[PDB]
Amino acid sequence: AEREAMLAKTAADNRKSAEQVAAAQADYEKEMAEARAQASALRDEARAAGRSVVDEK
Amino acid sequence: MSIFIGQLIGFAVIAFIIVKWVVPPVRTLMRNQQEAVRAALAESAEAAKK
């Protein structure tokens, strides 16, 4: 049973380590791009507010 | 007396034969197996670390 579980762990770790490195890279990229998207939306909201204030004034 | 000496020479021959031609292959199997299992446990440990 010990040999069996050892095989099982060798299998999972390799897999889970690979998948978790991939997931860490993907999640860092996703969070960074979400931050960029929020920044772009904020800048566009500022542009819209500026256009609105110039038009109203 | 003589029977014991003759059989003892025969047993020396048997021991030499097994040590020279039968022991090496069995030892190779054990080393491949035991050594291999050691290597596998090691790999599993490294993978857990990873």
UniProtKB/Swiss-Prot annotation, chain A:
Subcellular location: Cell membrane
Signal peptide region: none
Origin superkingdom: Bacteria
Disulfide bonds: none
Family: Belongs to the ATPase B chain family.
Quaternary structure, from the entry: F-type ATPases have 2 components, F(1) - the catalytic core - and F(0) - the membrane proton channel. F(1) has five subunits: alpha(3), beta(3), gamma(1), delta(1), epsilon(1). F(0) has three main subunits: a(1), b(2) and c(10-14). The alpha and beta chains form an alternating ring which encloses part of the gamma chain. F(1) is attached to F(0) by a central stalk formed by the gamma and epsilon chains, while a peripheral stalk is formed by the delta and b chains.
Task performed by this protein: F(1)F(0) ATP synthase produces ATP from ADP in the presence of a proton or sodium gradient. F-type ATPases consist of two structural domains, F(1) containing the extramembraneous catalytic core and F(0) containing the membrane proton channel, linked together by a central stalk and a peripheral stalk. During catalysis, ATP synthesis in the catalytic domain of F(1) is coupled via a rotary mechanism of the central stalk subunits to proton translocation. Component of the F(0) channel, it forms part of the peripheral stalk, linking F(1) to F(0).
Protein name per UniProt: ATP synthase subunit b
Shown part of the complete sequence: 58 to 114 of 170
Swiss-Prot record, chain B:
Compartments where found: Cell membrane
Highest taxon in the source lineage: Bacteria
Transmembrane segment boundaries: 3-23
Function: F(1)F(0) ATP synthase produces ATP from ADP in the presence of a proton or sodium gradient. F-type ATPases consist of two structural domains, F(1) containing the extramembraneous catalytic core and F(0) containing the membrane proton channel, linked together by a central stalk and a peripheral stalk. During catalysis, ATP synthesis in the catalytic domain of F(1) is coupled via a rotary mechanism of the central stalk subunits to proton translocation.
Subunit details: F-type ATPases have 2 components, F(1) - the catalytic core - and F(0) - the membrane proton channel. F(1) has five subunits: alpha(3), beta(3), gamma(1), delta(1), epsilon(1). F(0) has three main subunits: a(1), b(2) and c(10-14). The alpha and beta chains form an alternating ring which encloses part of the gamma chain. F(1) is attached to F(0) by a central stalk formed by the gamma and epsilon chains, while a peripheral stalk is formed by the delta and b chains.
Family to which this protein belongs: In the N-terminal section; belongs to the ATPase B chain family.
Note: Binds 2-aminothiazole antibiotics, which are antitubercular agents.
Protein name: ATP synthase subunit b-delta
Species: Mycolicibacterium smegmatis (strain ATCC 700084 / mc(2)155) (Mycobacterium smegmatis)
Full protein segment contained here: 1 to 50 of 445
